[PDB]
Amino acid sequence: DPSCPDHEHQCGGDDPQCVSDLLVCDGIKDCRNGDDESHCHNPFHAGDDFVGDV
Amino acid sequence: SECDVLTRLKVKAQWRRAYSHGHNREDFAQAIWRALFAQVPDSRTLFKRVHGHDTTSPEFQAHALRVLAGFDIAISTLDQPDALKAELDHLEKQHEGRHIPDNYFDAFKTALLHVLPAQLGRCWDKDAWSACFDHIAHGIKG
Amino acid sequence: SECDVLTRLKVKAQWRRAYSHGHNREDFAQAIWRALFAQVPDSRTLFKRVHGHDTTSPEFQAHALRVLAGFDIAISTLDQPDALKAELDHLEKQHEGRHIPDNYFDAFKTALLHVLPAQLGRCWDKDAWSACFDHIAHGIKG
Amino acid sequence: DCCSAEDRREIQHIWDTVWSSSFTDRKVAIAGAVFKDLFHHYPSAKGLFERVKVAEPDSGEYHSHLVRVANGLDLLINLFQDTQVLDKQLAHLAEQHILRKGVTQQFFKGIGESFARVFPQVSSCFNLEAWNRCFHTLADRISRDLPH
Amino acid sequence: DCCSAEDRREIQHIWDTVWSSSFTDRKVAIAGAVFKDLFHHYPSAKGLFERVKVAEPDSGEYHSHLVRVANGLDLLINLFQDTQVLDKQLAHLAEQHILRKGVTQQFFKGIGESFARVFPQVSSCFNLEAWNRCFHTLADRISRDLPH
Amino acid sequence: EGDDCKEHEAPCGGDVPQCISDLFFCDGHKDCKNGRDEDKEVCSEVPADIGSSFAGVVSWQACEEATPHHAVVTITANERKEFFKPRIWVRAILAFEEEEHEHHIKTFQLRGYYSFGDRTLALGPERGTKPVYGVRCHFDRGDDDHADCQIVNPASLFVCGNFAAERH
Amino acid sequence: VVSWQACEEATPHHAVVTITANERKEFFKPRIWVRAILAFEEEEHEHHIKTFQLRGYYSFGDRTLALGPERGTKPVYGVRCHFDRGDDDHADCQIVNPASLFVCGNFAAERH
Amino acid sequence: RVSHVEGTHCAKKEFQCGGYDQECISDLFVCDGHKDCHNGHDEAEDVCDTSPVKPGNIFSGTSHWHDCLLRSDHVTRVVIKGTIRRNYFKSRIWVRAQIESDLIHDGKKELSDFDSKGYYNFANRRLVLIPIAQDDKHLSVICDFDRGDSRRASCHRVLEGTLHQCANLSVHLQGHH
Amino acid sequence: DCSILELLKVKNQWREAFGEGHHRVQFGLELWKRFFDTHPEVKGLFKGVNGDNIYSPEFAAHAERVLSGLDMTIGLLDDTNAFKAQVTHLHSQHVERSINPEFYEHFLGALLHVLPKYLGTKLDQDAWTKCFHTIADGIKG
Amino acid sequence: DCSILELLKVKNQWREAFGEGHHRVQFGLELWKRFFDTHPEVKGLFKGVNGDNIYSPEFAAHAERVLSGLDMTIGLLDDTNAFKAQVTHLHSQHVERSINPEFYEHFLGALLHVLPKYLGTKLDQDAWTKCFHTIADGIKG
Amino acid sequence: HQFCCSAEDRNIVQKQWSVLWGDTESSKVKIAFGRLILTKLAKEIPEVKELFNKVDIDNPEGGPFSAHCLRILNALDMSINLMDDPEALDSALDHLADQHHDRPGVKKAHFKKIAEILHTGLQQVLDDYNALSWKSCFKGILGKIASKLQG
Amino acid sequence: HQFCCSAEDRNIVQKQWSVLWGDTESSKVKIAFGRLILTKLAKEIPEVKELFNKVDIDNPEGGPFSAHCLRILNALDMSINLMDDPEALDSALDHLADQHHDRPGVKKAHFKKIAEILHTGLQQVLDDYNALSWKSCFKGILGKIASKLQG
Ligand code: HEM
Ligand code: HEM
Ligand code: HEM
Ligand code: HEM
Ligand code: HEM
Ligand code: HEM
Ligand code: HEM
Numbered sequence A: 001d002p003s004c005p006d007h008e009h010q011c012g013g014d015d016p017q018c019v020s021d022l023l024v025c026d027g028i029k030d031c032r033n034g035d036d037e038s039h040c041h042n043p044f045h046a047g048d049d050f051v052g053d054v
Numbered sequence B, C: 001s002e003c004d005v006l007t008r009l010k011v012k013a014q015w016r017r018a019y020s021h022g023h024n025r026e027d028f029a030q031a032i033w034r035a036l037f038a039q040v041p042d043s044r045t046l047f048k049r050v051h052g053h054d055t056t057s058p059e060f061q062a063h064a065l066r067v068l069a070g071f072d073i074a075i076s077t078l079d080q081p082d083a084l085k086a087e088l089d090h091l092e093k094q095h096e097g098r099h100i101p102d103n104y105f106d107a108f109k110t111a112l113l114h115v116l117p118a119q120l121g122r123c124w125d126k127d128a129w130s131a132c133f134d135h136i137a138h139g140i141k142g
Numbered sequence D, E: 001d002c003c004s005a006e007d008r009r010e011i012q013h014i015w016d017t018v019w020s021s022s023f024t025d026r027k028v029a030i031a032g033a034v035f036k037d038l039f040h041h042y043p044s045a046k047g048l049f050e051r052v053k054v055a056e057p058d059s060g061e062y063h064s065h066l067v068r069v070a071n072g073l074d075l076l077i078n079l080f081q082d083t084q085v086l087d088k089q090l091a092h093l094a095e096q097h098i099l100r101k102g103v104t105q106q107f108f109k110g111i112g113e114s115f116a117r118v119f120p121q122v123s124s125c126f127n128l129e130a131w132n133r134c135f136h137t138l139a140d141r142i143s144r145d146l147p148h
Numbered sequence F: 001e002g003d004d005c006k007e008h009e010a011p012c013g014g015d016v017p018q019c020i021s022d023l024f025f026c027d028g029h030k031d032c033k034n035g036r037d038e039d040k041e042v043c044s045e046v047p048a049d050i051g052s053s054f055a056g057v058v059s060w061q062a063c064e065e066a067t068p069h070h071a072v073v074t075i076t077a078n079e080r081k082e083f084f085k086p087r088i089w090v091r092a093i094l095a096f097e098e099e100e101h102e103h104h105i106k107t108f109q110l111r112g113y114y115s116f117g118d119r120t121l122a123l124g125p126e127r128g129t130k131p132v133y134g135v136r137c138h139f140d141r142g143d144d145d146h147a148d149c150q151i152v153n154p155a156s157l158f159v160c161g162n163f164a165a166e167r168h
Numbered sequence G: 001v002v003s004w005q006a007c008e009e010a011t012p013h014h015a016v017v018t019i020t021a022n023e024r025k026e027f028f029k030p031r032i033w034v035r036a037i038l039a040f041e042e043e044e045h046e047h048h049i050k051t052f053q054l055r056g057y058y059s060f061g062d063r064t065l066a067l068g069p070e071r072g073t074k075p076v077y078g079v080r081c082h083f084d085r086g087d088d089d090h091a092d093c094q095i096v097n098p099a100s101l102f103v104c105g106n107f108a109a110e111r112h
Numbered sequence H: 001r002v003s004h005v006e007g008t009h010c011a012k013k014e015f016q017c018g019g020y021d022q023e024c025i026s027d028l029f030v031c032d033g034h035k036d037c038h039n040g041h042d043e044a045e046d047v048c049d050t051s052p053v054k055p056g057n058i059f060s061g062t063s064h065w066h067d068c069l070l071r072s073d074h075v076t077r078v079v080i081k082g083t084i085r086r087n088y089f090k091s092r093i094w095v096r097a098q099i100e101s102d103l104i105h106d107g108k109k110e111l112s113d114f115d116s117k118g119y120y121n122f123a124n125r126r127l128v129l130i131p132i133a134q135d136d137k138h139l140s141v142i143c144d145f146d147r148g149d150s151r152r153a154s155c156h157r158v159l160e161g162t163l164h165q166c167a168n169l170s171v172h173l174q175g176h177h
Numbered sequence I, J: 001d002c003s004i005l006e007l008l009k010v011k012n013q014w015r016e017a018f019g020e021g022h023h024r025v026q027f028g029l030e031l032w033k034r035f036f037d038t039h040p041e042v043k044g045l046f047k048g049v050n051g052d053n054i055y056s057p058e059f060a061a062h063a064e065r066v067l068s069g070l071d072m073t074i075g076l077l078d079d080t081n082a083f084k085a086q087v088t089h090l091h092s093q094h095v096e097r098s099i100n101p102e103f104y105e106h107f108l109g110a111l112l113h114v115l116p117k118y119l120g121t122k123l124d125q126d127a128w129t130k131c132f133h134t135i136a137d138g139i140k141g
Numbered sequence K, L: 001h002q003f004c005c006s007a008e009d010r011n012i013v014q015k016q017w018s019v020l021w022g023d024t025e026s027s028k029v030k031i032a033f034g035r036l037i038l039t040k041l042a043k044e045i046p047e048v049k050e051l052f053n054k055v056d057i058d059n060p061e062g063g064p065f066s067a068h069c070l071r072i073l074n075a076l077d078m079s080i081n082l083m084d085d086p087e088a089l090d091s092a093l094d095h096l097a098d099q100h101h102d103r104p105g106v107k108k109a110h111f112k113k114i115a116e117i118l119h120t121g122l123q124q125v126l127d128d129y130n131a132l133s134w135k136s137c138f139k140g141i142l143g144k145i146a147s148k149l150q151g
């Protein structure tokens, strides 16, 4: 079952916490463990190709 | 055993369980066909028109389905001997001219009698099926 | 505390919660027994007839259930003093002749008072249970 | 060898593969076979059905009769988990059979035997033992108060 | 210290361990105890129940009365999440108590005290604070328009 | 997690989910886009090997009024027809663990099949042997050595009891 | 697979012996008392398989599984398995006559 | 966690033996010193580990309130102060503990603590602590050591009578003040 | 005028209401509850089977017999011979009792009232009235 | 003639309908909806409690009082003394209002109509009518 | 063994029996039911009433007889709940047979009668009652209890 | 292609068509329905009846004609079930077109009529019938079958 309200983010860790989806990766720490500010690596880089099979 | 009124009823019910739910029906058909062609691979030449070389082709699917439909009419009318005789005559006409050894019909039977219990998986009677198949096949041959 | 009209009502309700649902009832019984025999292992000799050496035997299960049934009558009639007196006299007769030290009754009490809160797990009163058990046990002894 | 709850649940479950349809064809065929067997083994009983034309087994009267039986048995089996109602319906059926003179308990044992002979021919995984154990229960109630 | 929603939910939940049965025995015993306490502390009020035969506490009249009270309280508590209906029933009960002369607000404070004294004796995990906070609410409505 | 397969279909497994027929597993032709229906592990015929026996303690819910004891089902014979390879036809025996005092053990002879795609051992009464019991074992622990079994009624597939089977 | 020398006139087929129950008395531990079943692999056409119920013991020092007819079950067959391959998984078995211990057949047993 | 999603076929107050295993047992027989499972799982070491309630343990976590009280998120500590385990009834450990809460109520910080008592039940791995003679609106605490270890627990602040959950709390051992 | 498609439809919907044993009993009982509620003038006819108490075993067994016979007739809807034979058999079972022939219309009324509660499909009222009438016509003299 | 098994049965089924608070209110309201639907002649008696609007708080509180009293009497069914006392108390609460004594039969009618919708078991109509009548008899003069 | 009082039979019996004892005054109901059964037995077979002299049957509303009705009802409850475990059930029923043997004057015919009375009452109180299973099982239970009787 | 008899259209058609064949005597229903459709076609366009002389349409209750009604109904069933696989469907429908070409006298107008009759009947028998999807798909099916007709 989801650990968080429909539009929130689970900070995870041994001390869980929910934080608004709009506050993840905005450069301001909202999680007590700063999880919202360490995801911040975009998988897509200019030039990347992904190939999807049906 | 022989094709009683009763054992015909049994075969009819089991065929309902196996065929009547058009889900895996083309797969049921094709399984029967892979088995048949595995036993008598020389028979594939009779099916050039309908792509017997590739049983996954749409033309051969259409075929195997036509077959199972005919067989379905035959089973469905096991308790209506007039209609059964009619369908069997029809199939016979559709098959005359084609040089089909008893060999191949035995292949078909063996195929059906192995795919059927795999389909039902449960309560089925190979003797009743043997008898009634023999009746239908005799009907198609002459 | 002492066995009031009220605290008797409380004990009665809690006993309902613990005993009345014949699921783990034989297990409840047997837990009580393992505790008792753990405290005073010399008492097992009194139960030779009913296989006190193996509390998992069907004979001993039947026993422990008989017990809990008697105790159930006793608790159920805490608010019906005439009936309570009757059942207590009956149990007393069933127990007279058997050399049972107060020792063993204290073992029984302690067993019950440890298995009970494990069963209920929640809202229970060990003082009320102590009082009412003391009343019933005094009734069985004389 | 009583009629266990398992036996009754079994029969109730397998029952929808023996006839049971929006059409009466299977009922007629199977019940018809049951009676062919009965009359084969106890031919004296065949006289009891002149009123329905046992004499013309393709007749609407005899068909409708067979269907009446089949549906009667259906009714009995459907009531296996409603013992009171089963008892009343059993009594009703019994009286219906008492009105008919010449119907004996022996004929009922006979029809039990013929049912047990016919059913396993029309459906696989038919629990014959269960059927026997339960039929005994049904028939012994229907056929009591009838000539031994 | 008002009567919170939590308090009401609490009372509603614990309530089925204090009497509440298809039988009236527990209601009679417990309500009876409540009144023994009330009369012990405010003996002047005992006169108000001659009509229901307090002098004979084993009488059907007095029993039936106790049950009437218990069920009245039941009705009140069951209406905790239906404030409008609770208000109407509260008014009704109030007028029923205005018809009886000699019934004062002081007697109501008294019975609140005796309830609070009795309930924790018959069930563990009974929230006494919640009970007090909510009873104050109920009684202050029933007993207004009465005489201090 | 389950799968979006239909009756008479089984998942191919692998990175891109695909469902194919029961009747297409291990028949020598690749029907999966990734060929998994012909994988050597998928098509392991070990769960139906002669001498294979799977045992475990049964919790009953009907049919048998005995308390939890072991059940063992032992494959005594097999046959995999070369023209129809997606099934292994097996003869097995269901037996129950009974006390030292019983000395009148009950033994049920079964026949059925192992289906590769289903990963299922399905057993019913041997020819002319009183339709008492059938067995359904599902090898879903990721190996050929454990299976979730039910002792069922051959007709209704009604569950009489369950045991967690383990290969011994 | 069993090579027969008497009793059974069938050609080499499998034999399987399955332990169905056991009991190791705590006061007499050098034996494990077992209930087993000897069964034979038979053709698709037979459909009337033969099953023999056995009881006996496993002896640790002997490394021997010794089986004979279950109580009241017609003294037809007994089994002697010797686990002498260095593990609990292979055994040299003989299907014998319960009385004479006469060898009817031999099979190299393997745990499956 | 997976085993939690799966559930069991056992009744309440029952203990399922193995992981896949079908045998059920009364939770009054779990870690009582007697082998009750066909596989002896009810007396296994992982099952019967007594370290979740080893006295001296200080579990700390953040309490998130959503009922009963109107507190903002705040630290709570469950401090194990003592255990009693009767040799005649080993099925359960009777735990005594102190529940502390750091509340930043009115501009400044203030400790809210109370003494409590309850039990750890091996079968469901559950620690129940109800407030010792604390009518003073201190809520009970129920912790489940359901994270695979004896170091972390999923807790709730609850009302004792109804088991209504007023707060979500997840403690980890950390432990040393 | 109960034609092929009519009787086919009625057969199907009947299978929906009566073919499931778990709600066949509720169906029968509710049919009767409705019938007796809206036409209590009818109850007199059923003194033999406690029609005043539909929750009794007597009446339950009755309702069961009813639904069974109705099943037979609906199932014989396509076999004209056996149909006529069955309907005359029903006639024999009803002619002895002084039954107002317009009670059958009321019976159909209750049937149509109760049916949709046990149908996963939309009640084909035309087909049902037509077939019910081709049955009742035969039951009546 | 409301004997031991009768009153035991009625007690049980009553516990089913009234013992669950989540559907007690629906039960009361539906009882009244039915009563007033099938006997609107009765509505005049309840002007004091907005009987014309059963969805009002006045009437809700009323229906609650009803079910409560019915609970008391059903619960006192085994204590003859306290029963008689309670039933005469109900009598006092009804005698002042000119109530047609055959309205009680109609009340029972609505009760028996609504009850099975809140019973997981089959309604024991005999037990219910017998006990209801041993109550109403006492309520009436 | 199976068929006569099978596993499912026992499940049905237990499930249906469970319906009676819903509330907290189950004791009241057990006493009422036991009193009914017993006094009905004393009416049907008058020679029986003398056998209950030591439990004061002449005052059925009295203490001793009430406690006794609890005794029988609880024995019945126990035996029903024990149907899962045939060996334990057998042992308990055996103890009961012993107890009824020590009361001379108790005869098998009395048990036949009380069987009839029991089933008749259960048909009324229980809303769901599978007579086949109940009779199947109680034939064996009452059979075993009356098995050590002289007459 | 999409829009005209789309994927969902086909799903609807299959799902709704499945409702008819619930029980074991599906053959009876297929024969009845086929007989209805065909005789209605012979009434609407009388020149058609002669074309079914070899299947004994003059005795519609007869064996040969019944077996034939099974032929058409099973072809229809097959083509409906084949709508998942457009290529296979196309092949089967092509075979049908071939078969109807070898029967001189069969004209496209007959197929237009039988389309009308078919939809009218299906509106009755089916309780749930999405006319838009059904007509969308059968336009294409019947279209393809009548595609090789001379007239
Ligand atoms: C009793 C089992 C069989 C049944 C029910 C059956 C039925 C059918 C059917 C329905 C057709 C399609 C006729 C048409 O629409 O033109 C057909 C054609 C054909 N059959 Fe069979 N058949 C059976 C066994 C066999 C056997 C064993 C053989 C020998 C391999 C065989 C050889 C053929 C051939 C070569 C065709 C021509 C396919 C084409 O090009 O259209 N059949 N049969
Ligand atoms: C107040 C708690 C107790 C209650 C309610 C109780 C009740 C019972 C009951 C119902 C029986 C069955 C008698 C029969 O059916 O004939 C029994 C027998 C017996 N009791 Fe207790 N008992 C209690 C405490 C004890 C104590 C502490 C002991 C000393 C260990 C004890 C020793 C025995 C013995 C030796 C028997 C007979 C054993 C046999 O059946 O062979 N009881 N008691
Ligand atoms: C297998 C259990 C049986 C069932 C469920 C059954 C059912 C029925 C039914 C439903 C009827 C129609 C009664 C009516 O609608 O008025 C009937 C009539 C009859 N039964 Fe049976 N029956 C059974 C066994 C037997 C036996 C063994 C015999 C002895 C041959 C028998 C002899 C008759 C006769 C003579 C009639 C009168 C039919 C007539 O009107 O001519 N029945 N039965
Ligand atoms: C705790 C809140 C109370 C509740 C819910 C309550 C409930 C009731 C009920 C249900 C009745 C019966 C009315 C009827 O059925 O006509 C009643 C009557 C009465 N009440 Fe109370 N009561 C409460 C407190 C009190 C107090 C504190 C007193 C002061 C001693 C009191 C004095 C009376 C008297 C004298 C009657 C007359 C009874 C009779 O004559 O039959 N009540 N009350
Ligand atoms: C087409 C709808 C009906 C069907 C299928 C039907 C069928 C039946 C059946 C099967 C029986 C049982 C006869 C027996 O076994 O002896 C029966 C009896 C009876 N029918 Fe109907 N019936 C229908 C309509 C009606 C009508 C409209 C009434 C008038 C209210 C009616 C009044 C009765 C009565 C009074 C009995 C016998 C009651 C008794 O046995 O005590 N039926 N009917
Ligand atoms: C045995 C079934 C019945 C029971 C248990 C019952 C019980 C009650 C109760 C408890 C009250 C509340 C009195 C008060 O709060 O002062 C009441 C009032 C009343 N009852 Fe009934 N009653 C029953 C049947 C009926 C019948 C059949 C009628 C006729 C329609 C009726 C008409 C009324 C009226 C008009 C009132 C007072 C209306 C008002 O307060 O404005 N009751 N009844
Ligand atoms: C319905 C199954 C029955 C059950 C479960 C049952 C159970 C019991 C029990 C538990 C006792 C108490 C023994 C003790 O505590 O010392 C008892 C006593 C007794 N039973 Fe029954 N019984 C049954 C049937 C009968 C029958 C049919 C009779 C024949 C009249 C009978 C005659 C007696 C007598 C005379 C006593 C002596 C009571 C006393 O003196 O205290 N029982 N029974």
Ligand code: HEM
Binding pocket: L048, L051, L052, L054, L055, L071, L072, L075, L076, L096, L099, L100, L103, L106, L107, L110, L111, L114, L142, L145
């Ligand atoms: C509704 C779509 C139709 C389908 C699915 C269909 C299907 C069939 C099938 C499967 C056959 C059997 C051919 C064989 O196996 O040899 C057949 C035969 C035939 N069809 Fe149709 N058909 C349809 C519409 C029509 C219509 C509109 C006509 C115009 C009268 C027609 C005229 C014929 C004729 C004359 C035969 C010859 C039957 C014989 O003599 O054996 N079909 N049809």
Ligand SMILES: [C-]#N
Binding pocket: B067
């Ligand atoms: C077909 N061939």
Ligand SMILES: [C-]#N
Binding pocket: C067
């Ligand atoms: C105690 N026995």
Ligand SMILES: [C-]#N
Binding pocket: D069
């Ligand atoms: C009978 N027929």
Ligand SMILES: [C-]#N
Binding pocket: E069
């Ligand atoms: C208040 N009585």
Ligand SMILES: [C-]#N
Binding pocket: I066
């Ligand atoms: C008709 N009844």
Ligand SMILES: [C-]#N
Binding pocket: J066
């Ligand atoms: C009444 N009201």
Ligand SMILES: [C-]#N
Binding pocket: K072
């Ligand atoms: C019996 N007592």
Ligand SMILES: [C-]#N
Binding pocket: L038, L072
């Ligand atoms: C075209 N039939």
Ligand SMILES: [Ca+2]
Binding pocket: A023, A024, A025, A026, A027, A028, A029, A030, A031, A036, A037
């Ligand atoms: Ca942030």
Ligand SMILES: [Ca+2]
Binding pocket: F024, F025, F026, F027, F028, F029, F030, F031, F032, F037, F038
């Ligand atoms: Ca493949």
Ligand SMILES: [Ca+2]
Binding pocket: H029, H030, H031, H032, H033, H034, H035, H036, H042, H043
């Ligand atoms: Ca243990």
Ligand SMILES: [Zn+2]
Binding pocket: A009, A010, A011, A012, A035, A036, A039
């Ligand atoms: Zn994150």
